[PDB]
Design a protein around this ligand. Structure first.
Ligand SMILES: NC(=O)c1ccc[n+]([C@@H]2O[C@H](COP(=O)([O-])OP(=O)(O)OC[C@H]3O[C@@H](n4cnc5c(N)ncnc54)[C@H](OP(=O)(O)O)[C@@H]3O)[C@@H](O)[C@H]2O)c1
Ligand code: SF4
Lengths: 95, 147, 80, 64, 296, 88, 171, 59
């Protein structure tokens, strides 16, 4: 309506951030946190303004699962720095 | 005019209150330096704190004998020290090589490495005489930065 | 005993804190089922209203009266 | 002895004594009756709003 | 709104005047005399340390990376001072909707203070020891959340004001007997230098010793209380300070009496041994309001 | 105000830095496994956080079996930490 | 003075620009503290006592703190200035100008948008909530319960068992 | 001469095992170690301030 107009624009910036890569790999996982942060604001406001009571638990569950991908995918980042020197999107062997 | 002269003494009183020395265990002198901690003769929290640390300390006590191996080692400690720094050469070895002196390895004077402000002459520098070194340091701080 | 008496004193000797991790947490499951006191706590949780009570239209009803103190409905008065 | 330690404790019985008393004694000057109301949930928040409406104008908490 | 300044200035003095207590009470433990020359009983020394380090002592940075190193003490002092706001006391300054959730949040963000200091130094020599210091704080915050919940599940909501009212006749030390023992150890992990130890460097002292008083007060709310008395604020103010001071003595007791536990065996006391114990008591504290009626 | 209370602490904290700054003029991957387990346990804590504030209106018998269930699996995750964690 | 949430939403986007741009994981990591901490105010203003502080506990005091380790574990390269680098400054200036141009259109109420929805003003209508509930108030006032959603508790516990087992097996 | 430092299993069965486990489960001996410094705090310290008092010597 008015508040939603800015956070949807904030969502598109975080979306492009996932799709953009220059040397570093760490930015993607930082953008995954930001994407879930922008989704957290959008989910909360819809339930808070238009009352639900039962459905207000759903973003709390969403908060937990946001960290699950941002830890188990984050663990794979360290494994790249064990095989290679430092984490790079430029450094890949697969064809 | 009057406030300028009195405020200078207040900054000098801050160092007269507390002085943090470096705990150099490079001597038999260092065991007498541990007698400063021993309750019978204490400057502990009278001024001296045994926390030391290479950077936070204001005073560094060069305890006794220094070799040519420790000559570059003690010099880099002095550079890490803050600008208000006072160096006490506690012990006859620190003053100019009490023993040894004419030896190949021992550095003579300590001032060839690090400049000294207060000299303590004693081999086993008795804790009674060691109490002078800190009290004289507090007395020597009189006037700093006139203009 | 081969596992009851044998694997008890060894557990108290080697890694003694692990005895408490199974005993306290284990009894935490057993106690709320067998002891007759848990049924009382459930009743007071339901009796305490969160929102305002709704009024129903009276057309042949039993155990329902006015808002004034009278013998009607359940109304909890368990233990003082 | 303790006569050296106790002045170190007595100075802590003044400085840590301030935040407790300063928060309590301020309610005499700010409010009428030495009390600040706690919000928690909208039930108690609405009672604060209607009290100002019941002839108080600027005051939030006022008797009658 | 003047009371905020009446909760920073006397608090900064309390961290300053700790220097007397931290080596005189510690002094008599070690049979040595602490402060004596500087003041009548050394009362002039705590303020003398401030004139020494702030004004005259200059800076020599390793690299100074633009924003950092001159940002880490702001996070150190800022988070330590903001912890005073949600505190219940006789009366709290701007009481939060939920109390203890704000307390655990600002302590978990206080981990950054030792993180940014490790990034300030360019050398690899310092950061390995810096991450080890993070591990001392990060691990104990897992259990700190668990032992908090077990006290809350017994009585009261997250609000800190309700925790005073529930302790009317008897203290919470007696029902939470093994849990009270945990808060003596778990609080010492946050840079207290008793079970394990690692200009702007002087500002870290003003922040680290501030958390020591903070954990002493927070233990005296969760476990101590004695009386409330809303009509008499005089009786509560004196009685609260004595209870907090006795816990401050126990914090300096561990620093003098007991050696370091090793970093590896710090992860054998916790995780291996404490985490199975705390959760078993947490399992017990779930059943307690169900077995017998105990709901706020 | 919460905004006025928070900003006053930070602005006084910044001022203390300038005092010291302006006035005077003349490797090992074993640490990673500890850090990850912190995150995975705290999320189970996040699910077990509502307990004292949640159990007020809901039925106790339906909750009792589910409340303990999360703590049991939180111990099973620690049981996997006993089958060779490492030298740490 | 008039707006409360709208000012915080601008600072939210301001911190997010260092993600489409590439200012290294050190300065890029700093963005999540700025955008996160201000982002709590957007959540808190409409309500939610528990859910508003969960960002401070998990996203800020858990998520990014683990990310603090990985920056030192992999790709540290001694932190550098994010202004001297090519195309990084170009991505940053274009990132802000996509949002700051829309800020100028907020004045005189109506603003041009790519989406079909209009923005208008919405200052008093920004919250769009009445008093309604009083005792045990707010939908987020009792946000989480183990009852009703019994199935959700089992799978979340199952997924967190996977994480501990899997990551241990990789290394 | 021989003195022996090794205790050679202080715990045997039931009664001797539990008290050796109690000190490791909680603390006890740490609280007993706390009491050593506790009484040490009360007794008067032997301290000499140099500008006024003087230490012992010899002829
Ligand atoms: N690279 C260059 O800048 C350059 C180039 C070409 C030639 N030079 C020549 O090389 C010399 C460089 O010397 P400098 O500038 O390095 O010296 P400086 O740092 O100024 O040191 C001179 C010291 O003498 C003291 N002093 C001098 N005059 C004084 C007075 N009237 N009253 C009280 N104290 C006084 C000052 O003490 P207080 O501070 O306590 O008063 C000061 O510490 C110059 O003389 C210049 O002719 C230099
Ligand atoms: S002066 Fe005497 S006591 Fe000191 S180091 Fe030399 S030999 Fe040893």
């Amino acid at each position: 309506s008015m508040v939603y107009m800015n956070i949807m624009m904030a969502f598109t910036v975080s979306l492009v951030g996932l799709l953009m890569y220059r040397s570093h790999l760490m930015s993607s996982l930082l953008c995954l946190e930001g994407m879930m942060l922008s989704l957290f604001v959008m989910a909360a406001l819809t339930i808070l303004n238009s009352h639900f009571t039962l459905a207000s638990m759903m973003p709390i569950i969403l908060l937990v699962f946001a960290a699950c991908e941002a830890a188990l995918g984050l663990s794979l980042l360290v494994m790249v720095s064990n095989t290679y020197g430092t984490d790079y999107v430029q450094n890949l062997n697969l064809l | 005019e009057y406030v300028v002269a009195k405020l200078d003494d207040l900054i000098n009183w801050a160092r007269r209150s507390s002085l943090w020395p470096m705990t150099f265990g490079l001597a038999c002198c260092a065991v007498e330096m541990m007698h400063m901690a021993a309750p019978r003769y204490d400057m502990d929290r009278f001024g001296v704190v045994f926390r030391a640390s290479p950077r936070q300390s204001d005073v560094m006590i060069v305890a006794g004998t220094l070799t040519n191996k420790m000559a570059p080692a003690l010099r880099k400690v002095y550079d890490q020290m803050p600008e208000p720094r006072y160096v006490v050469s506690m012990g006859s070895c620190a003053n100019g090589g009490g023993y040894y002196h004419y030896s190949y390895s021992v550095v003579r004077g300590c001032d060839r490495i690090v400049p000294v402000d207060i000299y303590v002459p004693g081999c086993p520098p008795t804790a009674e005489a060691l109490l002078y070194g800190i009290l004289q340091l507090q007395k020597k701080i009189k006037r700093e930065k006139r203009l | 005993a081969e596992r009851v008496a044998a694997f008890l004193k060894n557990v108290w000797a080697k890694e003694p804190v692990l005895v408490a991790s199974f005993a306290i947490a284990g009894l935490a499951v057993i106690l709320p089922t067998l002891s007759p006191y848990t049924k009382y706590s459930l009743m007071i949780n339901x009796x305490x209203x969160x929102x305002x009570x709704x009024x129903x239209x009276x057309x042949x009803x039993x155990x329902x009266x006015x808002x004034x103190x009278x013998x009607x409905x359940x109304x909890x008065x368990x233990x003082x | 002895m303790w006569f050296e330690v106790l002045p170190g404790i007595a100075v802590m019985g003044v400085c840590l004594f301030i935040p407790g008393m300063a928060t309590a004694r301020i309610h005499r000057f700010s409010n009428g009756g030495k009390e600040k109301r706690v919000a928690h949930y909208p039930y108690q928040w609405y009672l604060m709003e209607r009290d100002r409406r019941v002839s108080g104008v600027n005051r939030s908490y006022v008797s009658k | 709104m003047i009371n905020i300044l009446m909760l920073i200035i006397p608090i900064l003095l309390a961290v300053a005047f700790l220097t007397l207590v931290e080596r005189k009470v510690l002094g008599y433990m070690q049979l040595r005399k602490g402060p004596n020359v500087v003041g009548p009983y050394g009362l002039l020394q705590p303020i003398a340390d401030a004139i020494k380090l702030f004004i005259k002592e200059p800076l020599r940075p390793a690299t100074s990376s633009a924003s950092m190193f001159i940002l880490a003490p702001i996070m150190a002092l800022g988070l330590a001072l903001t912890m005073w706001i949600p505190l219940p006391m006789p009366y709290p300054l701007i009481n939060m909707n939920l109390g203890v959730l704000f307390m655990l949040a600002m302590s978990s963000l206080a981990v950054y203070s030792i993180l940014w200091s490790g990034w300030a130094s360019n050398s690899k020599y310092a950061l390995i020891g810096a991450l080890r210091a993070v591990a001392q704080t990060i691990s104990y915050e897992v259990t700190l959340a668990i032992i908090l919940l077990s006290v809350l599940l017994m009585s009261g909501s997250f609000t800190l004001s309700t925790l005073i009212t529930t302790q009317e006749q008897m203290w919470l030390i007696l029902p939470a007997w093994p849990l009270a023992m945990m808060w003596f150890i778990s609080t010492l992990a946050e840079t207290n230098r008793a079970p394990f130890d690692l200009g702007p460097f002087a500002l870290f002292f003003m922040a680290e010793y501030a958390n020591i008083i903070m954990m002493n007060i927070f233990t005296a709310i969760l476990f101590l209380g004695t009386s409330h008395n809303p009509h008499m604020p005089e009786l509560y103010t004196i009685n609260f300070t004595i209870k907090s001071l006795l816990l401050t003595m126990s914090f300096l007791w561990i620093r003098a009496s007991y050696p370091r536990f090793r970093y590896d065996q710090l992860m054998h006391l916790l995780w291996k041994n404490f985490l199975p114990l705390t959760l078993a008591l947490c399992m017990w504290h779930v059943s307690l309001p169900i077995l017998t009626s105990g709901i706020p | 105000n919460l905004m006025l209370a928070l900003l006053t602490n930070f602005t006084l904290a910044t001022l203390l830095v300038i005092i010291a700054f302006w006035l005077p003029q003349l490797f090992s991957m074993k640490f990673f496994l500890v850090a990850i387990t912190f995150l995975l346990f705290d999320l189970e804590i996040a699910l077990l956080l509502p307990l004292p504030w949640a159990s007020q209106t809901a039925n106790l018998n339906t909750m009792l079996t589910m409340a303990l269930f999360l703590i049991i699996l939180l111990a099973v995750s620690l049981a996997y930490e006993w089958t060779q964690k490492g030298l740490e | 003075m008039l707006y409360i949430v709208f000012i915080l939403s601008v600072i939210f986007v301001m911190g997010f620009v260092g993600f489409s741009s590439k200012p290294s994981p050190i300065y890029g990591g700093l963005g999540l503290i700025v955008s996160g901490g201000v982002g709590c105010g957007i959540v808190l203003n409409f309500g939610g006592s528990f859910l508003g502080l969960m960002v401070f506990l998990i996203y800020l005091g858990g998520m990014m703190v683990v990310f603090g380790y990985t920056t030192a574990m992999a790709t540290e390269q001694y932190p550098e200035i994010w202004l001297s680098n090519k195309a990084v400054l170009g991505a940053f200036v274009t990132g802000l100008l996509m949002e700051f141009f829309m800020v100028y259109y907020v004045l005189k109420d109506k603003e041009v948008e790519v989406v079909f929805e209009f923005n208008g003003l919405g200052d008093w209508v920004i919250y769009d909530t009445g008093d309604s509930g009083f005792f045990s108030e707010e939908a987020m006032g009792i946000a989480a319960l183990y009852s009703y959603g019994t199935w959700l508790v089992i799978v979340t516990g199952w997924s967190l068992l996977i994480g501990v087992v899997v990551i241990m097996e990789i290394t | 001469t021989y003195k022996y430092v090794n205790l050679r299993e202080p715990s045997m069965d039931m009664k001797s095992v539990t008290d050796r486990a109690a000190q490791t489960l909680l603390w006890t001996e740490l609280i007993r170690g706390l009491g050593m410094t506790l009484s040490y705090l009360f007794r008067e310290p032997a301290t000499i301030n140099y500008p006024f008092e003087k230490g012992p010597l010899s002829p």
